[PDB]
């Protein structure tokens, strides 16, 4: 129903992830932890580092226990190494309950901590199947569920707007964070939060590709990713169609590549010339699907300025990948996302905080009759 204590518990910088406040140790040590549905390890800085303002001091915790084992976790971008252990953990603006969980004490890292991000650790909300060093290391949320009465489920609402914000509802669904109805898509396999995209549209125009290219070699939801990552083939086709749709104005190849950034006089951004993007996702009913639609306000991430001056500049937040489709923040900032683990499904609804203009709004509609959706998945 209503979780007044957890609403608005997230923060973050643009392009630097979303984090929540947590405590660790006895007495409690406060640390900001980024929310990553793309991984399954709970790790926090535990040694001095240029980009860290504070870190986990194990010798100061009377409830700390050493597991006497190291761990290495490489991410698509960034990586760290540390020592495994456990300790008491809590979430101030979350469920009023303390739990014991495994903790990786990061002692070495590379291009992982961001200068000025404001977070000092990461909370992998995915499944143990992708936990390092192996699937035996029980993930944080799993421990929270087994040690408390909290329902096996959490929801996320990421809001664009260089501060950012949002809310992480643990154990429930807050009806005030969205409008319209919630549409669920089945979780294909429990490792990453994998789903199946069966159709892609650009301003209503179908991309017309084998619905397998959309999920090659997979499609996952990652709050820990900034852009909308798209496999090479799909990326090329989308960019082409998006270029056509906005042809009334030309931009350098650097822009579409994510290198350079476009700008416009304060408040003159021509949103209307940019196309809306829709992704159709497999539904819970056979032959049934639903679609989610985002706006250029979602895929054109605002940044500083070409000359660090005063003008509205943005960066194309849609890029290609070789590890499948990644529905990152550019997708999530448009919706309230329910990670229904108990029912092996992910729900989508229009977020009541999503950025948009008076003429257009993000959407989630259904149902659409779609045949041969099972074949859309890669093997």
């Amino acid at each position: 129903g209503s979780f007044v204590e957890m609403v608005d518990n997230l923060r973050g910088k643009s392009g630097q992830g979303y984090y929540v406040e947590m405590t660790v140790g006895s007495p409690p040590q406060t640390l900001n932890i980024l929310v990553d549905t793309g991984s399954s390890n709970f790790a926090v800085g535990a040694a001095p580092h240029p980009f860290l303002h504070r870190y986990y001091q194990r010798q100061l915790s009377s409830t700390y226990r050493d597991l006497r084992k190291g761990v290495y976790v490489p991410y698509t971008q960034g990586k760290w190494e540390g020592e495994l252990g456990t300790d008491l953990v809590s979430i101030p603006h979350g469920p009023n309950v303390t739990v014991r969980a495994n903790i990786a004490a990061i002692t070495e890292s590379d291009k992982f901590f961001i200068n000025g991000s404001n977070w000092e650790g990461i909370l992998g909300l995915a499944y143990a199947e992708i936990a390092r060093p192996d699937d035996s290391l029980e993930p944080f949320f799993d421990s929270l569920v087994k040690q408390t009465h909290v329902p096996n489920l959490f929801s996320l609402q990421l809001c664009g707007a260089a501060s950012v914000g949002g809310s992480m509802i643990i154990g429930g669904i807050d009806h005030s964070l969205y409008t319209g109805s919630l549409w669920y898509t089945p979780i294909r396999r429990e490792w990453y939060y994998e789903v199946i995209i069966v159709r892609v549209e650009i301003n209503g125009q179908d991309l017309k590709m084998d619905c397998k290219e959309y999920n090659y070699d997979k499609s996952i939801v990652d709050s820990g990713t900034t852009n909308l990552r798209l496999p090479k083939k799909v990326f090329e086709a989308a960019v082409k169609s998006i270029k056509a749709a906005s042809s009334t104005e030309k931009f350098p190849d650097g822009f579409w590549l994510g290198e350079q950034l476009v700008c416009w006089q304060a408040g003159t951004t021509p949103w209307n010339i940019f196309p809306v993007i829709s992704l159709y996702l497999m539904g819970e009913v056979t032959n049934q699907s639903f679609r989610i639609t985002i706006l250029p306000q979602q895929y054109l991430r605002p940044v500083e300025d070409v000359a660090t001056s005063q003008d509205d500049c943005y960066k194309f937040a849609i890029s290609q990948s070789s590890t499948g489709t990644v529905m990152g923040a550019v997708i999530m900032e448009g919706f309230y996302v329910v990670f229904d683990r108990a029912r092996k499904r992910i729900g989508f609804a229009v977020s009541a905080c999503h950025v948009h203009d008076e003429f257009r709004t993000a959407a989630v509609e259904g149902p659409f009759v779609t045949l041969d959706m099972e074949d859309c998945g890669y093997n």
Binding site: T37, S39, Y75, S223
Partner: peptide, 5 residues
């Protein structure tokens, strides 16, 4: 700017 396993 982030790409988290």
């Amino acid at each position: 700017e982030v790409n988290x396993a």
